[PDB]
Amino acid sequence: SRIVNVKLSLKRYEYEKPFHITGSVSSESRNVEVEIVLESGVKGYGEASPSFRVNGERVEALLAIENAVREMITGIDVRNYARIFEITDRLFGFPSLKAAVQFATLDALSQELGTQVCYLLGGKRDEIETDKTVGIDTVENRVKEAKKIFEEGFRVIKIKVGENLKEDIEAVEEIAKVTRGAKYIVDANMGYTQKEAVEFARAVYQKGIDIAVYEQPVRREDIEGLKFVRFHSPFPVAADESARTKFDVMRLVKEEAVDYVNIKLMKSGISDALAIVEIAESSGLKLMIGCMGESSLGINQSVHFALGTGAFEFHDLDSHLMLKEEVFRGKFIQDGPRMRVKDQ
Amino acid sequence: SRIVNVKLSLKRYEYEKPFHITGSVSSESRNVEVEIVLESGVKGYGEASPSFRVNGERVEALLAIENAVREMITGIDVRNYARIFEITDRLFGFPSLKAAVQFATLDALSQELGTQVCYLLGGKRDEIETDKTVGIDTVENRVKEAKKIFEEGFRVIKIKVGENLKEDIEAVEEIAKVTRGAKYIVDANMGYTQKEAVEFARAVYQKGIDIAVYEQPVRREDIEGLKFVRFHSPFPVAADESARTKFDVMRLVKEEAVDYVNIKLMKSGISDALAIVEIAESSGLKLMIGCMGESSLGINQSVHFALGTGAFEFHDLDSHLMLKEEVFRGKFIQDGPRMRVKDQ
Amino acid sequence: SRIVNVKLSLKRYEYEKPFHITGSVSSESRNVEVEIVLESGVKGYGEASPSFRVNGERVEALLAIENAVREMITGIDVRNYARIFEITDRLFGFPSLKAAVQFATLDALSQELGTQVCYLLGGKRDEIETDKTVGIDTVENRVKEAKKIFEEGFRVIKIKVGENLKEDIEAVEEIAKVTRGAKYIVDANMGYTQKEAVEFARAVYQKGIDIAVYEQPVRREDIEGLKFVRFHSPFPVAADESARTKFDVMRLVKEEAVDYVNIKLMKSGISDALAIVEIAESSGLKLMIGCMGESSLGINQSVHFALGTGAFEFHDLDSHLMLKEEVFRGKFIQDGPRMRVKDQ
Amino acid sequence: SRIVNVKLSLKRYEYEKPFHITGSVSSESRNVEVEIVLESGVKGYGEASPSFRVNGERVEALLAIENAVREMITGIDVRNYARIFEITDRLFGFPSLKAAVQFATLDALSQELGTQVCYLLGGKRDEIETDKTVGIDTVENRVKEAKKIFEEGFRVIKIKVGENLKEDIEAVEEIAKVTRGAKYIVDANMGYTQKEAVEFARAVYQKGIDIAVYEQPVRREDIEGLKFVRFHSPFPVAADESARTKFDVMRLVKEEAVDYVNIKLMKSGISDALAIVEIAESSGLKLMIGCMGESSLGINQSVHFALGTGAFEFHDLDSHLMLKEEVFRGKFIQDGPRMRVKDQ
Amino acid sequence: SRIVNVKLSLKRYEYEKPFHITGSVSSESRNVEVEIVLESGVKGYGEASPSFRVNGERVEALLAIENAVREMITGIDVRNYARIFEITDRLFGFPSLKAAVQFATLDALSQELGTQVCYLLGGKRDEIETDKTVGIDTVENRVKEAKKIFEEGFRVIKIKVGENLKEDIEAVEEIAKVTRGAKYIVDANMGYTQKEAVEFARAVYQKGIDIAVYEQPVRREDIEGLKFVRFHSPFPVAADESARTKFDVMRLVKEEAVDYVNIKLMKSGISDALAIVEIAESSGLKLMIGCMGESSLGINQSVHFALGTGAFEFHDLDSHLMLKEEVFRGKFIQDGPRMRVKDQ
């Protein structure tokens, strides 16, 4: 049935503690929740968690375009969801809102069909497992946090690096010693030069440490640099900030620049994310899925995407786990590091 | 709900006249119909129209593997269709059967969800239009046939060439004269050398004739030859036989070999065809969709695929129109050269 | 001296008639004017003319981030303009505002230094000349409009094409006949396939018509397509939508994709535009400068940029001339199609 | 205001001790000071420190063209500095004089505007820090000099190598032991083969020594050799002699040959140096700035360039620190290894 | 025997009329004559005809370095000429002087050996033939000048173009009409864009005119542009300004940029010129030899080089023929457009 209203609302979520990554420290997520209302009375929901650093977005700006978004899709039947996806692909300057609107569309459609979004998308998996992230801090505090995560039962530990190469090498080496059995993802958030990035990898390799995925060591535009790291260090290299659109991923594949792509709905929307999954499966690329600052309602989007496509070797879906005092609003089951589909 | 049976049956369909293409002439279509039965009682249908020349398939061979196909997917819920797609991707030696089983799966699922396959696939378009094909014959007979097609309301005329460069040039020029306003697709079915293919295009261009799509002038393995034709003649060049899998298309894109890909479900199945649509839309590829010897139930698969994805500039879905007075078994409206979505 | 305030204000300007280009028609320009106030009392001005189609921007979104922009640069001395440029490079999601803030900074600094922005930028030229644009309409109306422009003294005529290849060829041929001596720029605003773009160029060449610059015939992401047109047609090919950032231009240069780049301050800001001038002058790129929907105060930014750097073979700075009777608010002399530096 | 005179004068500066690099030993700098006099009475100053080895120049030859230089720019207003830059770009056979004249122009212009050259150039930084260089000598003497430099408070030590691979490896390893905490730049001044250069780097890497920048290990024309070193050894590789012009740098970027460029005003002039900064910032290249045999008045040129653009990770501006008995004639503050902008 | 003195002297030669080429017009040749005196009493002679536009040289600068040149080679036996060549290769900033000194060396050695320079170089040919050049002027005057040249017995006519595409096309077409049977070399001296250069060639080709060699249509640094012209127009393309050194030529060969190189001793010296001959003969390069403003003593250098190596399809050795009534000072026979070896 046809969309009759679209509502955007500011929702704020406080962190338990400041989240520090290369070039950014944040203590709060300010997101935009999207509600799509159909003539049937069905309501679908999405969440835009904007990124100034990655997408150039500001939450004030997303909220400002409510009327435009409404006018762009009101009157369209959610069964013609490809029309909605094409229209919302015009929101390339507001990719988090693109994502939220596209997901809300599928959330509404799946209800009208008596199913769930993961099933519309293929129903490949019934369960996925997330890592949890260690932010930047003193070496001692990074080690402490990594151990905590390991004690919580997380089997993959994501470690932020990028601001201090020497301390980064030390932190990862100390973490490895006290979390024997864990797999490690290292995310440099564009902090290193090509040569610094190679040296980080070599240093930890020399201690017999294996890094499962080494994310975006160099700047967004430095595709040749990503390739250099890939070809001169022993760990799989992922594009994150360099992989926002489906066109970005075609370029990465053509240049043989990466082993992995980290898909985020907040970069790509559902439309480009689906294209990227297909490109990757046609090209020997492996995939992980990540997040920005989504609450449980926002993480829901990626949970259904990951369950449905089953495309991901790794899942970095932990933003909702970093919140101070939250009421759970996902349409999935959180069970420790695992997420599962609802019977209903 | 879960698959409880899978049935394969031989179905034969007679042509109105022998269909002559480069290196092949046939008077009959021998297809394998697939029925999937669910525990709910819902039945989904697909059709495999095999190709010995393109896929290396034989109809007897498809029939012989009924028990294997049944064992592979019985017990799986169609809501987990990605699992069925991944399993049936193992049928790469029987791609027409891969397509039929994958479509039958979606036919059944759409019924359980109270919708149509085109809608599962995005519901992008409500209407498409097909060309109709002029087979190889004497120049006089080719012209007669083209005039017949034009008087049946077709606005796009597909002209088979490839066995006689001089007569092919003459036939196309004479056809152009008696079908003013039509658009032309020329399909050489691998018959020309790269230089012959260039000279065919040049000869027709010099007469002021525009060819909308120039399909597969050279052999399947001759990607560099396809590229040569692309870069040295004025009309858009399509891969057909060179584009069977999603991997083939990634290679064509990397090599900049073609302007178009002709997707056929009988080459790719649903899984690879969806991948190819995504790759093309991420790479400035244009698309057409074609067929083998599908009857109306078989063409239904492509009609829903094309309506739902809306991915195609041109449609060459005319096999059922070349067959001799069948009872109509599609789930779409055939409106002269137009196909329209049902109500349902 | 130091910035003490930054003010953003909505300013609307009516067109003389609807401006139709490939995929877009507008009757009004809604811009954001930027005022920077220094502790000295000096005020500098810029204008953001946003583009949804090219930059993904919306005017409401620009307005919404006034406080953020103010916080980002308040307290900084305009003599340290490189610091302001680096900070405002973070506004990559709001490139038109990036441009306006960067220019306002130089407008204020030049006043404190007792000079003009063109002189800060090198003072290369005292005079430039702009084309004027023929929008899409019926062939008869396009010809009427071109004749009007020719009788207004313009020596370079920019002709929009892209929606109808046959009518575009006819319009350009008819325009050429009634504007003998004019030079022509043809802007396809991404409307053609690579092969259609080649055939447009060939058709006009065969009539003995020379096109000075053939702008962006293909889509933004289709760099290989741009190169194809460049290598297979006789006129200089320009990137417009494909050249937004300095990084885009390095890629175009590496791929040998174009003969020209059309710099627009609304895509690049001052910072990337200066980089692009330097890259082009180091690579055998030629340059033109264009606009969006700037009023006279907005066009001033480009006039000073073009006068100072002297980098452009062609100038397409006509947006203010398409606007309905404004009070002139430039800091340059408008002398028919010519712009000249002030005394001051 | 307009240039009314240009004067060239020979100035000789004796070194405290002979400076030995690969293929060259010198005990004195013979420079050409440039004075530009304006009609306002303002006087701007530059210095050409010619290089026979790098630029093919001889000081006698620079002095010989005084009248030509005068005639080329007399009567031009320094506010049109781009015109002066374009004219003096014709002095590509006398690049040190090109640099001196271009800087003298900005020195005069900045006085007329009531500011400083660093501010005309962006005012990005208020302070920079230089390394100091260890020349070639016996291993013992090289170690002694490196220790002295470290004791002087220099945090980056530049070590000349290139004439004796075995002794070079020994010297760098011994230096590292006695200067723990220092960063190292190694400059081979074209002395090594590709394979020798890789082996030098590997040998020192094996002792746990990090080289911040490894400059020009191979000959000027051996771009492929520079790339080979870059791709097969662990340290960032810089072009110096291979990077004289902006066109050279475009080639280096296209070939992915280097991690760094060492800009010297004496190679590039201000015009090409500014282009190189822009190219580098558009291409993932990092930068250092170096010198020839400039006195304090000559080093002033690079100090303002480096302060203003803030483009450099490393500064090798130490030629004026190697002089016997000199009267300071810079327009900056020297404060140990640091240089700072004047309040005035 | 050993060099005991080296003398440089200014020699001026007046043209018959101003010689206009793209971006340069001159009425006089100011050359530096080199005399090398041996202990045996034998004297060898060379001539440097410098080029500011191509080499960046000034005659005053060449004169200024007499003492340096003398110190560099005095005391060396001319039988060890490779030592003198390697030393004078250091004069890369004064390439015309490099050439003059290297030739004077061979002039002296050949005398001591009782032979001629052409014989030292292989004695391949006894006779060569030169073109003569039509400078830029009005179309009427260019045609007049070409007719004059044709009536002086020249069979190859070199036509300068580059400043006015339309008039250049007209001039060449009119010249072709009045010089039936002549071969044509067209030298654009870097005046055209790649596309303008293509269109010049196409326009003349369409008139049935063949251009034997089309020299340097684009700028020195624009190697990719040279290649573009080569691949997109029907006449052989030559590098002139882009081929100064042996390293330049290796790059041109690797890039497949040209059909021809124009060797000039004033760009390359004897050493690089011999290298270029060997490279060309190993790569399917064809060669022509040109000049700057050499008098008869200067042209002698090129005549012996061309006679001895026999490497050139075309000779453009006409500078002495454009000079106003000189006493003949060559060591060859000038026989109309032909040059022949002496007896001795």
Ligand SMILES: [Mn+2]
């Ligand atoms: Mn990441």
Ligand SMILES: [Mn+2]
């Ligand atoms: Mn076909």
Ligand SMILES: [Mn+2]
């Ligand atoms: Mn445009």
Ligand SMILES: [Mn+2]
């Ligand atoms: Mn160096």
Ligand SMILES: [Mn+2]
């Ligand atoms: Mn020439």
